Amino acid sequence: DRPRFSFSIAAREGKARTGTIEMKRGVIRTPAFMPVGTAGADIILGNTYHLMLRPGAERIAKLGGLHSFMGWDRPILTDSGGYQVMSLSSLTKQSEEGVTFKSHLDGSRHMLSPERSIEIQHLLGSDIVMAFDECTPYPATPSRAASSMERSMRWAKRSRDAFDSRKEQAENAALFGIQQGSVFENLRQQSADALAEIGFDGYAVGGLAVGEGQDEMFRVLDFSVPMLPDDKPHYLMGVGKPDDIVGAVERGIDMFDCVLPTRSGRNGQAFTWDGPINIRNARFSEDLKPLDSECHCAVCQKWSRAYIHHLIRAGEILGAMLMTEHNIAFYQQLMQKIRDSISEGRFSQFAQDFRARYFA
Amino acid sequence: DRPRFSFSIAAREGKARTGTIEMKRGVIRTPAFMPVGTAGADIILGNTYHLMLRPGAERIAKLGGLHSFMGWDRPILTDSGGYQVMSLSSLTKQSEEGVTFKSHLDGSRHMLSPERSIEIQHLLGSDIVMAFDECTPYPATPSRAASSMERSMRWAKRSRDAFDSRKEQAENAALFGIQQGSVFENLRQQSADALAEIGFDGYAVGGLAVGEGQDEMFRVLDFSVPMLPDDKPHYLMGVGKPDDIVGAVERGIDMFDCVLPTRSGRNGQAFTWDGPINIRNARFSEDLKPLDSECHCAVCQKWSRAYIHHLIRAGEILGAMLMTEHNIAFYQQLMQKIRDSISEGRFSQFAQDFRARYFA
Numbered sequence: 113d114r115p116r117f118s119f120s121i122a123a124r125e126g127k128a129r130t131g132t133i134e135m136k137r138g139v140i141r142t143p144a145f146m147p148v149g150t151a152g153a154d155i156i157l158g159n160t161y162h163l164m165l166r167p168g169a170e171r172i173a174k175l176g177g178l179h180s181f182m183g184w185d186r187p188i189l190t191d192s193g194g195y196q197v198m199s200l201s202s203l204t205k206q207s208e209e210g211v212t213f214k215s216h217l218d219g220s221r222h223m224l225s226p227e228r229s230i231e232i233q234h235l236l237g238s239d240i241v242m243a244f245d246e247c248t249p250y251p252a253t254p255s256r257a258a259s260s261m262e263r264s265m266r267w268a269k270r271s272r273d274a275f276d277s278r279k280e281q282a283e284n285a286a287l288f289g290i291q292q293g294s295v296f297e298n299l300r301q302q303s304a305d306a307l308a309e310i311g312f313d314g315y316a317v318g319g320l321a322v323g324e325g326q327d328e329m330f331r332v333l334d335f336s337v338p339m340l341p342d343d344k345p346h347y348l349m350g351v352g353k354p355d356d357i358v359g360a361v362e363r364g365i366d367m368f369d370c371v372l373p374t375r376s377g378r379n380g381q382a383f384t385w386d387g388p389i390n391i392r393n394a395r396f397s398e399d400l401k402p403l404d405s406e407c408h409c410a411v412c413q414k415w416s417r418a419y420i421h422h423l424i425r426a427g428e429i430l431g432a433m434l435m436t437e438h439n440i441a442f443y444q445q446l447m448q449k450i451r452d453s454i455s456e457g458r459f460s461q462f463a464q465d466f467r468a469r470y471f472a
Numbered sequence: 473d474r475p476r477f478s479f480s481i482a483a484r485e486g487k488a489r490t491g492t493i494e495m496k497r498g499v500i501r502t503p504a505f506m507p508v509g510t511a512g513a514d515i516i517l518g519n520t521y522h523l524m525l526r527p528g529a530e531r532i533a534k535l536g537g538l539h540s541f542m543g544w545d546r547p548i549l550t551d552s553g554g555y556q557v558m559s560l561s562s563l564t565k566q567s568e569e570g571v572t573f574k575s576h577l578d579g580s581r582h583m584l585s586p587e588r589s590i591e592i593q594h595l596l597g598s599d600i601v602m603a604f605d606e607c608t609p610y611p612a613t614p615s616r617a618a619s620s621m622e623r624s625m626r627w628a629k630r631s632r633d634a635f636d637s638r639k640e641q642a643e644n645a646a647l648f649g650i651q652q653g654s655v656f657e658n659l660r661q662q663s664a665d666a667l668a669e670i671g672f673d674g675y676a677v678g679g680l681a682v683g684e685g686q687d688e689m690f691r692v693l694d695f696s697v698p699m700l701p702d703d704k705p706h707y708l709m710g711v712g713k714p715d716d717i718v719g720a721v722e723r724g725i726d727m728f729d730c731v732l733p734t735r736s737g738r739n740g741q742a743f744t745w746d747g748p749i750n751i752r753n754a755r756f757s758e759d760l761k762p763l764d765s766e767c768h769c770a771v772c773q774k775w776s777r778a779y780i781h782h783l784i785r786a787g788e789i790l791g792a793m794l795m796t797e798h799n800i801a802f803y804q805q806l807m808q809k810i811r812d813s814i815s816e817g818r819f820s821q822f823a824q825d826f827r828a829r830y831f832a
């Protein structure tokens with residue numbers, strides 16, 4: 113029987129690592145991409161913020177938990193909810209206790225605190241639970257970044273204690289802490305130290321992919337990822353485009369999530385090894401090639417760019433579904449190639465070849 | 473090797489029949505439902521009117537024909553295009569030659585005539601080609617219904633001659649004639665006689681499902697279907713709801729098409745043996761049963777009403793795709809049950825049981 117949580121590094125190249133997380137519901141191969149569950153992957157995401165508002169966490173628990181609800185019996189990761197509250201909610205009120213906000217769907221009042229976030233995630237039944245943090249806005253002054261990070265670290269301890277108080281959660285799920293500190297090395301160090309003192313099963317790099325751009329994101333990763341425990345997984349939240357993933361793996365990241373595959377799939381963008389393409393453009397109306405020349409997905413085995421272009425232009429849902437299936441599969445082929453290249457000691461060459469072709 | 477076209481009736485009960493159409497690209501089991509190709513089925517529909525306008529029939533032929541374009545190597549049926557021209561186009565101009573109209577997409581002028589309709593269908597590469605007819609509006613006076621039907625019969629002969637002039641089409645495709653005459657028995661008889669004198673591979677009942685309602689449609693079918701050759705397939709165009717299909721089979725119809733499965737699937741309606749349900753309604757938010765209790769489709773094997781409700785309410789494309797997959801599968805299970813019940817001599821009981829449950 114698999115353990116509750118065990119991360120093992122099978123091979124390394126530079127700062128890059130490849131290995132496995134073993135959990136009760138399955139093995140997660142790393143580096144991992146974690147797609148939205150409502151879109152192969154070893155773990156999917158539940159959308160805590162949406163589920164809080166519709167149908168509510170209690171109701172999900174009444175229906176048997178997310179795994180039953182979604183028909184997915186493998187691992188599920190949930191965020192702690194505050195990022196989306198601050199991003200999407202109205203008339204939010206912040207305090208040391210947490211955040212209160214009004215639901216855009218029906219005006220009901222909702223609060224989120226470390227304790228309530230952990231309880232929501234418990235009711236949803238997720239396997240990887242995120243600590244309740246504050247994603248500091250960018251840019252931030254040093255003073256405000258420090259004050260925000262300090263609050264997040266107090267909330268990380270409250271998250272740890274709430275998770276440990278729930279026997280079923282403590283025995284069957286895992287808890288990740290989230291590093292903050294904006295772009296400032298000293299604050300990132302203080303945050304890493306505070307999280308390691310509390311102790312978590314994995315460590316996320318928070319506070320990035322919030323408008324800083326790739327050069328700055330990579331600069332922050334260069335010093336931030338080494339501050340985290342080496343023997344635990346490293347999750348970069350909100351990232352990203354394929355080139356962001358490759359560079360983040362080069363800097364020691366093991367886990368990724370982002371809206372791009374599905375957002376692109378619904379908006380006419382297909383990922384390929386030669387970069388993204390806008391399938392609605394007339395230049396694809398007579399292109400008999402598959403979406404990508406090397407892709408093994410079922411869409412690329414059967415249908416042309418011309419036909420997918422036609423479906424999307426005609427407003428047919430089949431078109432968006434085919435685009436999304438291809439994009440999901442592309443991302444998982446990217447991660448497989450990353451894992452294999454690290455395991456084979458040729459990831460540096462892979463990254464160079466990837467960039468030369470993706471940006472040609 | 474299969475023939476170009478051969479219809480064989482394997483069993484009968486009342487006016488109902490079950491059997492097979494053999495064509496070069498496949499066998500079609502009848503009674504048959506023929507889904508839109510852009511949505512198992514033995515034949516799918518190509519949308520002649522849309523394809524004429526985007527990308528155009530010549531361009532489809534350049535891309536290899538519909539079968540290649542759509543990735544479907546089995547039979548395809550296309551309509552002749554006028555129904556949609558009169559239904560959707562602007563500033564149409566009608567004459568004995570055909571109809572001219574302006575494309576809503578780009579203002580280009582297009583004409584349709586019997587000869588051009590057959591040529592378009594040739595370029596698309598369909599296997600079952602419909603004669604170019606005029607679907608008389610409902611209601612129609614006897615005089616106007618007669619004048620319209622007479623023009624359609626002249627156009628049926630022109631369609632026959634155009635089809636026969638194209639060797640590849642004549643040798644590999646089939647041509648159906650379309651009966652008109654509105655709701656008038658004498659005109660339906662004149663139309664049937666004219667079509668049989670020309671000679672077609674199959675016969676459609678046109679001019680129905682245009683606002684007359686089920687009682688009147690069935691009344692017209694009661695006298696109209698027996699007028700067609702018994703030994704050829706009978707196609708009721710534009711029909712319909714499950715209860716319309718059952719009653720039309722009871723009246724001698726062998727083939728059906730309609731927008732309902734896909735339109736419903738995109739608009740939150742799921743077909744079930746207990747009637748249609750509106751999955752977005754709050755009454756399904758905690759319903760753990762599948763869409764239908766007896767359905768064998770992959771959606772009903774895996775997911776609940778509650779989850780499909782959730783996806784559709786969240787605006788997720790996955791929800792509409794699951795609804796459509798279920799609805800397509802429901803329609804094909806309906807047709808299989810129809811075929812088996814006729815073959816087993818229990819279709820009368822099936823129809824009675826179907827109606828008692830569907831309308832409970």
Ligand SMILES: CNc1nc2cc3c(=O)[nH]c(N)nc3c(CC[C@H]3O[C@@H](OC)[C@H](OC)[C@@H]3OC)c2[nH]1
Nearest residue numbers: 157158159190191192195247318319320321349350
């Ligand atoms: C786009 N840039 C981006 N930077 C982020 C930074 C943070 C952060 O510092 N803290 C937390 N807790 N969450 C973050 C998030 C949200 C990730 C979730 O966003 C959700 O998608 C909307 C997704 O779950 C369906 C995922 O949860 C696993 C970020 N997103």
Ligand SMILES: CNc1nc2cc3c(=O)[nH]c(N)nc3c(CC[C@H]3O[C@@H](OC)[C@H](OC)[C@@H]3OC)c2[nH]1
Nearest residue numbers: 517518519550551552555607678679680681709710
């Ligand atoms: C809804 N009621 C309805 N009554 C109809 C009657 C006629 C008729 O008398 N003549 C012709 N030629 N076509 C008819 C049609 C259109 C069927 C096509 O309609 C297309 O869907 C929009 C479908 O092809 C994707 C199909 O072509 C195979 C009808 N539709």
Ligand SMILES: [Zn+2]
Nearest residue numbers: 407409412438
């Ligand atoms: Zn593909």
Ligand SMILES: [Zn+2]
Nearest residue numbers: 767769772798
């Ligand atoms: Zn089903």
